[PDB]
Amino acid sequence: DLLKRHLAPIVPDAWSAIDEEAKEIFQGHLAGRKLVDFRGPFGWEYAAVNTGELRPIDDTPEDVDMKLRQVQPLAEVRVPFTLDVTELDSVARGATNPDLDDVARAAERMVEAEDSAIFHGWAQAGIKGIVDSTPHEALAVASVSDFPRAVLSAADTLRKAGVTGPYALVLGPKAYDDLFAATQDGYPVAKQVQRLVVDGPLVRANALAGALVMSMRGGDYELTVGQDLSIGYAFHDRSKVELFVAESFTFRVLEPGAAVHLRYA
Amino acid sequence: DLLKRHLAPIVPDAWSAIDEEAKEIFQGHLAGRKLVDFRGPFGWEYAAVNTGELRPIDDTPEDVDMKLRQVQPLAEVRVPFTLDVTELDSVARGATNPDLDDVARAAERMVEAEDSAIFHGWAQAGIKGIVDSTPHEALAVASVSDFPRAVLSAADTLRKAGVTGPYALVLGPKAYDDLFAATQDGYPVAKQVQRLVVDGPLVRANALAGALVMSMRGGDYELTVGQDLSIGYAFHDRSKVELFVAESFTFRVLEPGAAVHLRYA
Amino acid sequence: DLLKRHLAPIVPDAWSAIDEEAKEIFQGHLAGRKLVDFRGPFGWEYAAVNTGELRPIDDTPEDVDMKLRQVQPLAEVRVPFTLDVTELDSVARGATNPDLDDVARAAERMVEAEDSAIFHGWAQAGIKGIVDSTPHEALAVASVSDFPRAVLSAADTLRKAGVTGPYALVLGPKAYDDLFAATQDGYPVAKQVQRLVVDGPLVRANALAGALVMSMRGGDYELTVGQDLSIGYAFHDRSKVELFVAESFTFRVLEPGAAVHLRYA
């Protein structure tokens, strides 16, 4: 009831239309949720992730030893958007293409925020992502044909760093497009690369600079979601209605050495 | 009974022969019906598609607000053709190849009309097609080998425009022939292109200029058919019998930004 | 749910009071709905009436014949009004005469709009009424005593025009008052007139200029109502609440020669 959706001047079918418009973008753009570990939605009142460490408190007496637990507080993010009440009424009159452009804009903005956090961190929320926290040095992939061998090198790094398990290749939009549009003497590079990596389709990540190789053994990267992506009502005028996309989440790099960055090719 | 078929001097087997000749062409040339949404045949008395919008009426008093509903009236199209009564009698005498050339000519003319409407519109009937109404700028495919990368670019456009879902590639006759006859260093381009798009066979569209990429998520383009393609009787002489192919249809572009044109390669 | 009534700061009993105030006026002033054919309320998404005709499209090729279906799009009309929240609260405190004057004003305004459309048309909505579309010439009724004979003449016209069936006499307010207040040598004219027409009570129409005679055989005039007369909520202040009366309707003159106008007496 924190979304206050029943207070909106919106017919149920328009609610379904907005939800479908957002959900299609979320399932078609959330690369992070498909490749890291995901701790299920815990609700609104889930506040922080228990990391398990302890911090030694200075200036304590000798007869007592005092330590402070360490936690990772979640970040709650809301992106507002606005819709026309007449457009939403249209769907009650049988219309099937109401103007839901701002719904898509806000949904992609939220996807951008969460994925940029997952990959390249978020200093304000105290989140370090996969790329900004790996200790290895990023491989250089001079050309698209360099992708197979470089990928193998990455895997070697992960085996020499102790990180076993099948390794997935994640591609930024430029990298994904160039790899899948490339042929080596007619033979497509993507076929060889897919032979060298996990059997699943290669993940295209919009918010990833260059490319990445990461272990999928599990337990390396954990995304905690308190309140999953939701659409809620804020206010409304005679003609304009204000909604928001809301999510409470945090991201933890359990094993920083479980992924290797690859500069763009 | 609007086709008045029982009034024709045609034996039932000749009716079946004409129907088969038309139906084979319809299933082998109707590309539009296989790639857009199709609202089922509603019958003869289905007049218009309810778009759901409202139009503000000018010059109205202050104490009243008046709006006019908006609809898309269907177009009813008949193409006549003529057959020899003796040729149609032949099939009652065991003949299996009666001269049904005009049946094929009329059937392909109707296919041409409907597909040209679907792709490039029809101003007289107030129909805008997929190509004439997309807002993006058509990609340039200089050569057949340019097809993969260009296709990827198209998909990128659709993802940046919010149009998710699997993307199908539709080919004009020239484009289809050149793509499927082409090899890059021996490797066929069509294999790579088919790897880059939906798993179904690529659709060849005779009435398409260049090529097209379009989302198949559904809800983007809607073809409404009131009366499906039918053969009806008009008049007959001592030797000549006049029939027609009849169809009542309209086509709506729900989301103009759901498809990208590609100039021919 | 297009009326959004559950969002209003109005107790259920005040809703019932407003509905009763409107419904009494609607049943006591809607003359059109009692004398024309009425196609039932089809809902909000019913857009247009299928007239059944076809229009020949110019500039079409010879091998194809193209015709456009003809429809009559409905008109959606909303008249706003405003009520005091304190007055509506009074009914929760046992009050039985809350100030619902604006409810009556809006209800009579809507009755005026619909009946004026039915009788004298509405150019903006593309509606022709009964009076403006009859082909005969309006009879002249010099005095109230002229009513019987003139009425008979009207019936004669309808029989000579082929329009059979019992004929009803509809009276404008001036005509109704003058006829029912008139006596010929003590004998009331209304008795003779009622003997000459259908057994039902003569209909008083507020929005009718002069009088009218019309066949009640059925199939002559058709009123289509998509959304029937309803009261809906628009907005509200701390003290003021805005509602509206809403209706989607259109009116069709199937047989223009089925009624005769009579100039006022």
Numbering used by the authors:
A (entry chain A), B (entry chain A), C (entry chain A): 2 to 266
Provide excerpts from the study.
Encapsulins are protein nanocompartments that house various cargo enzymes, including a family of decameric ferritin-like proteins. Cargo enzymes are directed inside the encapsulin nanocompartment by a terminal localization sequence (LS) that binds to the interior face of the encapsulin. Together, the encapsulin EncFtn (Enc:EncFtn) complex can perform both the oxidation and storage functions of classical ferritins.
Motivated by the apparent interior density in the Loaded-Enc sample, we performed single-particle cryo-EM on the Loaded-Enc nanocompartment complex. The reconstruction displays a T = 1 icosahedral arrangement of 60 encapsulin monomers, with clearly resolved secondary structure elements. Small pores are visible in the shell at, or close to, the two-, three-, and fivefold symmetry axes, where protein monomers interact with each other. Regions of the reconstruction around the icosahedral fivefold axes displayed a lower resolution than the other regions of the structure in a local resolution map. The monomer of the encapsulin nanocompartment from the reconstruction displays a HK97-fold typical for encapsulins, with the position of the E-loop broadly determining the topology of the encapsulin nanocage. With the imposition of I1 symmetry on the reconstruction, the EncFtn cargo is not visible within the lumen. This suggests that the organization of the EncFtn protein within the encapsulin shell does not conform to icosahedral symmetry and is rotationally averaged through our symmetry-imposed processing.
